[PDB]
Design an enzyme around this catalytic site. Structure first.
Site, PDB file in Angstrom:
ATOM      1  N   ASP A 296       0.813  -1.236   0.000  1.00  0.00           N
ATOM      2  CA  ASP A 296       0.000   0.000   0.000  1.00  0.00           C
ATOM      3  C   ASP A 296       0.843   1.282   0.000  1.00  0.00           C
ATOM      4  OD1 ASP A 296      -2.023   1.961   0.433  1.00  0.00           O
ATOM      5  OD2 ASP A 296      -2.363   1.329   2.512  1.00  0.00           O
TER       6      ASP A 296
ATOM      7  N   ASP B 166      -1.420   5.780  -5.192  1.00  0.00           N
ATOM      8  CA  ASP B 166      -1.860   4.850  -4.073  1.00  0.00           C
ATOM      9  C   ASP B 166      -2.274   3.397  -4.510  1.00  0.00           C
ATOM     10  OD1 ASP B 166      -2.844   3.691  -1.913  1.00  0.00           O
ATOM     11  OD2 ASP B 166      -4.549   5.054  -1.596  1.00  0.00           O
TER      12      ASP B 166
HETATM   13  C1  LIG Z   1      -4.746   1.829   4.979  1.00  0.00           C
HETATM   14  C2  LIG Z   1      -5.646   1.923   3.736  1.00  0.00           C
HETATM   15  C3  LIG Z   1      -6.431   0.631   3.445  1.00  0.00           C
HETATM   16  C4  LIG Z   1      -6.399   0.117   2.159  1.00  0.00           C
HETATM   17  C5  LIG Z   1      -7.125  -1.044   1.863  1.00  0.00           C
HETATM   18  N1  LIG Z   1      -7.066  -1.449   0.549  1.00  0.00           N
HETATM   19  C6  LIG Z   1      -7.803  -2.426  -0.065  1.00  0.00           C
HETATM   20  O1  LIG Z   1      -8.598  -3.143   0.512  1.00  0.00           O
HETATM   21  C7  LIG Z   1      -7.578  -2.587  -1.504  1.00  0.00           C
HETATM   22  C8  LIG Z   1      -8.515  -3.328  -2.270  1.00  0.00           C
HETATM   23  C9  LIG Z   1      -8.283  -3.428  -3.650  1.00  0.00           C
HETATM   24  C10 LIG Z   1      -7.117  -2.794  -4.213  1.00  0.00           C
HETATM   25  C11 LIG Z   1      -6.834  -2.886  -5.623  1.00  0.00           C
HETATM   26  N2  LIG Z   1      -6.632  -2.977  -6.755  1.00  0.00           N
HETATM   27  C12 LIG Z   1      -6.251  -2.072  -3.352  1.00  0.00           C
HETATM   28  N3  LIG Z   1      -6.509  -1.973  -2.049  1.00  0.00           N
HETATM   29  C13 LIG Z   1      -7.926  -1.696   2.824  1.00  0.00           C
HETATM   30  C14 LIG Z   1      -7.979  -1.146   4.108  1.00  0.00           C
HETATM   31  C15 LIG Z   1      -7.225   0.006   4.430  1.00  0.00           C
HETATM   32  F1  LIG Z   1      -7.323   0.525   5.719  1.00  0.00           F
HETATM   33  C16 LIG Z   1      -6.692   3.047   3.982  1.00  0.00           C
HETATM   34  C17 LIG Z   1      -7.288   3.532   2.651  1.00  0.00           C
HETATM   35  C18 LIG Z   1      -8.042   4.848   2.886  1.00  0.00           C
HETATM   36  F2  LIG Z   1      -8.561   5.285   1.667  1.00  0.00           F
HETATM   37  F3  LIG Z   1      -9.141   4.523   3.649  1.00  0.00           F
HETATM   38  F4  LIG Z   1      -7.222   5.830   3.526  1.00  0.00           F
HETATM   39  O2  LIG Z   1      -6.275   3.845   1.686  1.00  0.00           O
HETATM   40  C19 LIG Z   1      -5.071   3.223   1.764  1.00  0.00           C
HETATM   41  N4  LIG Z   1      -4.162   3.580   0.770  1.00  0.00           N
HETATM   42  N5  LIG Z   1      -4.751   2.312   2.656  1.00  0.00           N
END
Ligand SMILES: C[C@@]1(c2cc(NC(=O)c3ccc(C#N)cn3)ccc2F)C[C@@H](C(F)(F)F)OC(N)=N1
Ligand code: NA
Ligand code: NA
EC number: 3.4.23.46
Length: 376
Positions: free
Chosen positions: A37, A222
């Site tokens: 992430d 992101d």
């Molecule tokens: C920490 C956080 C997060 C990401 C995901 N991500 C996913 O579940 C996901 C699912 C599918 C894909 C793809 N392709 C990528 N990511 C799930 C829970 C989280 F807390 C918070 C989230 C916030 F926007 F909330 F800050 O944005 C980011 N950048 N990370």
């Protein structure tokens, strides 16, 4: 340098569930699948038997675990996690041949964080200390890695679209992962991987907005978000342009808000009435920019009520700024060149396409007044 065969194809995923890498923590090593992430800065893993989880970090089994006697409570818009902070030994088995002592947040309580049916058990935050929780003195994994080893201060990501796979090259760039040349945009401030967008065209027609609008109040790269997410005012313009572009076919009004899916029968999806979308990004030289071009293949996401091909519209409005999510990243090899504070884009060797059009990265363009485009 330039060649990391043991790191190619080291990412797995399921569509709409993100991309993960295998990691190990503790001694003896405990294997976990960890979401990659670039929009957060904590390394956080499940550490209690939540039912969605295949496995979890059992601190009691690790002889190297060091307790920090310190809690963290981390809410997001889509709920939260709370955990206990410690350090332990961490490797990436399809990463560099090194082991580092890193901060780990052991998640003991969470809500709407873990995905039921997913195959990952924590999150690897690759952005900078400035947004680490509880505060900027909890050193992120990547800072610890570079501090303790000879791994160079960069990593690159190739996210291959739709199950999903890809490559995280830690320490380098692998030339077989892209075609043509890399083009670089400055990371404007080291917190998220913040960039500046200078112009947006839908089928080469400019949204013609004051460019502070594309970066209100930031634009970031992101991998932990699915959508291309656009500031509300830009979203409105973007979508009316795409609506008009494709008034040839018709879909419900809910569809453009990601409030319902739409459906054509297996192999009738008409890609060609959907416009390409270019984003021009501030370049490395004064008055110089380049553009990246994506396809309906990136913004119309497959979902699998109905026995057909149903997609979701994955451009969405935002009040947190632009987010170049996995919609964008899946077209490109993306190099997070932390040492020179810049981010490079090249056409992905894997990206999903058709016979007429491909994702593209082109320069140089002359754009004036690009420093006006940052929101303060
Ligand atoms: C920490 C956080 C997060 C990401 C995901 N991500 C996913 O579940 C996901 C699912 C599918 C894909 C793809 N392709 C990528 N990511 C799930 C829970 C989280 F807390 C918070 C989230 C916030 F926007 F909330 F800050 O944005 C980011 N950048 N990370
Ligand atoms: Na170093
Ligand atoms: Na190449």
């Amino acid at each position: 340098r330039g060649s990391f065969v043991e790191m190619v194809d080291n990412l797995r995923g399921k569509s709409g569930q993100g991309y993960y890498v295998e990691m190990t923590v503790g001694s003896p090593p405990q294997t976990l699948n960890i979401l990659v992430d670039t929009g957060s800065s904590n390394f956080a893993v499940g550490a209690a038997p939540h039912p969605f989880l295949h496995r979890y970090y059992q601190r009691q089994l690790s002889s190297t675990y060091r307790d920090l006697r310190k809690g963290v409570y981390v809410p997001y818009t889509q709920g939260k996690w709370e955990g206990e902070l410690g350090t332990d030994l961490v490797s990436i088995p399809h990463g560099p041949n090194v082991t580092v002592r890193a901060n780990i947040a052991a998640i003991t309580e969470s809500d709407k964080f873990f995905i039921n049916g997913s195959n990952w058990e924590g999150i690897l935050g690759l952005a900078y200390a400035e947004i680490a929780r509880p505060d900027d003195s909890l050193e992120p994994f990547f800072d610890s890695l570079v501090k303790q080893t000879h791994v160079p201060n960069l990593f690159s990501l190739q996210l291959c679209g739709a199950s999903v796979g890809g490559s995280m090259i830690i320490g380098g760039i692998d030339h077989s992962l892209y075609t043509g040349s890399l083009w670089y945009t400055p990371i404007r401030r080291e917190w998220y991987y913040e960039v500046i967008i200078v112009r947006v065209e839908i089928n080469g027609q400019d949204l013609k907005m004051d460019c502070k609008e594309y970066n209100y109040d930031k634009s970031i790269v992101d991998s932990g978000t699915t959508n291309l997410r656009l500031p509300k005012k830009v979203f409105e313009a973007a979508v009316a342009s795409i609506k008009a572009a494709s008034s040839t076919e018709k879909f419900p009004d809910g569809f453009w808000l990601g409030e319902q899916l739409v459906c054509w029968q297996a192999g009738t999806t008409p890609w060609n009435i959907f416009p390409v979308i270019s984003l021009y990004l501030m370049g490395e030289v004064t008055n110089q920019s380049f553009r990246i071009t994506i396809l309906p293949q990136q913004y119309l996401r497959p979902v699998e009520t109905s026995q057909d091909d149903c997609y979701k519209f994955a451009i969405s409005q935002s009040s947190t700024g632009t987010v170049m999510g996995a919609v964008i990243m899946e077209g490109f090899y993306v190099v997070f060149d932390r040492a020179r504070k810049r981010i490079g884009f090249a056409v992905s060797a894997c990206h999903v396409h058709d016979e007429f059009r491909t994702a593209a990265v082109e320069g140089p363009f002359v754009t004036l007044d690009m420093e006006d485009c940052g929101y303060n």
